[PDB]
Amino acid sequence: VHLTPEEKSAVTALWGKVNVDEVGGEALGRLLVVYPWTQRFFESFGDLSTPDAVMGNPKVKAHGKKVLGAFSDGLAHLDNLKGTFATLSELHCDKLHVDPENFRLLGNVLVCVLAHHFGKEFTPPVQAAYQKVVAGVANALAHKYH
Amino acid sequence: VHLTPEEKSAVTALWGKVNVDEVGGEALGRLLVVYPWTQRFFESFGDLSTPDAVMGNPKVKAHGKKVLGAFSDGLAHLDNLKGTFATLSELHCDKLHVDPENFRLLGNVLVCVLAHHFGKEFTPPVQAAYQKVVAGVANALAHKYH
Amino acid sequence: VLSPADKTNVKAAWGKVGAHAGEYGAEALERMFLSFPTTKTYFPHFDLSHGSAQVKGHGKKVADALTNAVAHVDDMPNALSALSDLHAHKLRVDPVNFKLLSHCLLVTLAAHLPAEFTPAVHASLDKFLASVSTVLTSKY
Amino acid sequence: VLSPADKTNVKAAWGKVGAHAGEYGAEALERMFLSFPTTKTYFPHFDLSHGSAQVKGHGKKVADALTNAVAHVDDMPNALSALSDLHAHKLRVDPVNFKLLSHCLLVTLAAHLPAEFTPAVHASLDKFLASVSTVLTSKY
Ligand code: HEM
Ligand code: HEM
Ligand code: HEM
Numbered sequence A, B: 001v002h003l004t005p006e007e008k009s010a011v012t013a014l015w016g017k018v019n020v021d022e023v024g025g026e027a028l029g030r031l032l033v034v035y036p037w038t039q040r041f042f043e044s045f046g047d048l049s050t051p052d053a054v055m056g057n058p059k060v061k062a063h064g065k066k067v068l069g070a071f072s073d074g075l076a077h078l079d080n081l082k083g084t085f086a087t088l089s090e091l092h093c094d095k096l097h098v099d100p101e102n103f104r105l106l107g108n109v110l111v112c113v114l115a116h117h118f119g120k121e122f123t124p125p126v127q128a129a130y131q132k133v134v135a136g137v138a139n140a141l142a143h144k145y146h
Numbered sequence C, D: 001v002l003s004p005a006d007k008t009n010v011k012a013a014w015g016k017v018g019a020h021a022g023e024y025g026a027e028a029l030e031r032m033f034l035s036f037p038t039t040k041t042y043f044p045h046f047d048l049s050h051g052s053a054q055v056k057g058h059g060k061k062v063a064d065a066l067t068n069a070v071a072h073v074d075d076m077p078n079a080l081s082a083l084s085d086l087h088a089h090k091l092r093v094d095p096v097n098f099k100l101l102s103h104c105l106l107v108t109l110a111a112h113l114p115a116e117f118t119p120a121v122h123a124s125l126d127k128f129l130a131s132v133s134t135v136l137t138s139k140y
């Protein structure tokens, strides 16, 4: 995926102020709450019965932290997205058999979470830049299905 | 998009027998009937108000023939579908602005047509080989969006 | 909703299945498992060998359930209420997989109904299986 | 279907839009045009640039329809019948595009109502916009 120099500059500027410890778990939590079929894949994580349980779950938060780590890698290597996600693609595709549709859902949940935290700063031009990233990450993570 | 040596033979054997002058039109026809919103791109084509009109339309059949040409040209270049379809990618993506999801729907409608014309001969082993081809054509047509 | 023509076409084409319903279910399940291997993970302990009795038996139940849904075509949300809770609450089936089975049931009908699978009937069956799919994914 | 909890959630959240309906509606269209440029083709007769009065005007109609739909939550098929007819028959809007606008409405609401946009309300709002989108593509 091709970001313009201004887009790339705006994306990085926003990502710098993301709380690497909470945002990942907020995205992963909302996925499990909003698209409950995704819970099929985290039965090991314990109580996911209610929204507040899912968002309170220490394992959802700790896993979220790893999920954001992988987006940070992606941002750092936008010209090598397929490679960055090669190991995670064979994990999610060959071993877990997650439908690549859910990759795109998590991405859009991530965008909602960034919008919810940054308010006026998350402008439409900034959103458009981020919708190219998460689409790129989704396509990259789905390589083992292609 | 990796077809095994037997998958490529099953795909080739079947394709050889396809009536090159009708199957295209049948695929594009059923797309317009089953997915009406698709007629939006083919207002230049005249009467599309009923199934019979759609299948009877000389421009539908004339156009169906050009679509099946592009599928034939993909089946002879399975190892590089990005390059076979990068001309047609630009057209549908930058010029015509077709949402890439519709490439998938035409793919599956063509699979339904091949199923209608060959009967028992279109076994799952053969369908499964074609699902890889249509998914591959769709992914390559959509590449000027990635 | 489904036009009174759509129901007539669904009741016409599915009525012709009749006895072979059990065998078409099995073929549509085989078709989905081969075309879309992600679906196999919902059946981890199944014998998925070609013409396995277990798949024939499951193709039977799916086929019977669709038969029921044609008979309660005006009353599907309540006909398939227990089947909704199963697919949604217990099994957590990804909505996407319903479009995959629905498509593989279309390929199976076209391959078994040469004269009967006209564009019109195709569109009606498609709309029908989309309706069943909406009900089965409804309890999220 | 939407639950008592979900209706409560949508009425509470959408209630806080108030006089900003047109502003929110117009921001959501702008987000959709910039992020998903394929949507720009449905409005060829509009200036789609930032600050556009056609977009602000259309934003207001879109948001007003949503307020109307919130108020007819238990009776949406009939409330949006006319709108479904415009979107399905006349305009022929690709159902994919409703997902894209729906995502941008959630993003807009997320950016403007921080305290309101909890996980539970996010889930309710998403369900509601899916329900709106289903009715607006019902005449397909
Ligand atoms: C861009 C989207 C996504 C990213 C970046 C992502 C990233 C990751 C990462 C970094 C791991 C940990 C790798 C390891 O420890 O070896 C992981 C594990 C996992 N992911 Fe994802 N993921 C994504 C989407 C999804 C979705 C949509 C699902 C399911 C609906 C999913 C299910 C899982 C599961 C089940 C695990 C293993 C968890 C465990 O057993 O402990 N992922 N993912
Ligand atoms: C596998 C999927 C598809 C293939 C292989 C395909 C292939 C083609 C080909 C070969 C042409 C002729 C280009 C030329 O003569 O220069 C064409 C034109 C076109 N395609 Fe597609 N296409 C596909 C899907 C779609 C879909 C889904 C739509 C719309 C929903 C679409 C809309 C068009 C339109 C509007 C034209 C121009 C028609 C005209 O000249 O009036 N295509 N496509
Ligand atoms: C038209 C669509 C579908 C129909 C009519 C249907 C119907 C049924 C029926 C009748 C049962 C038997 C349940 C019982 O005995 O109470 C069942 C079970 C099941 N269905 Fe479906 N189903 C559909 C789609 C799907 C899809 C798409 C999947 C997965 C990709 C799926 C996965 C299952 C599983 C895992 C079971 C339980 C089997 C077991 O005992 O291990 N279904 N379904």
Ligand code: HEM
Pocket (backbone or CB within 6 Å): D039, D042, D043, D061, D062, D063, D065, D066, D083, D086, D087, D091, D093, D097, D098, D101, D132, D133, D136
């Ligand atoms: C929740 C989703 C939506 C709502 C509530 C909505 C609502 C409306 C309303 C109220 C109108 C004007 C009715 C009138 O003036 O008579 C309208 C017109 C229109 N809508 Fe939508 N809409 C939605 C989604 C979409 C989407 C996704 C698209 C395209 C991607 C779209 C394209 C249009 C177009 C082209 C018009 C015509 C406006 C004009 O004539 O300039 N709508 N919509």
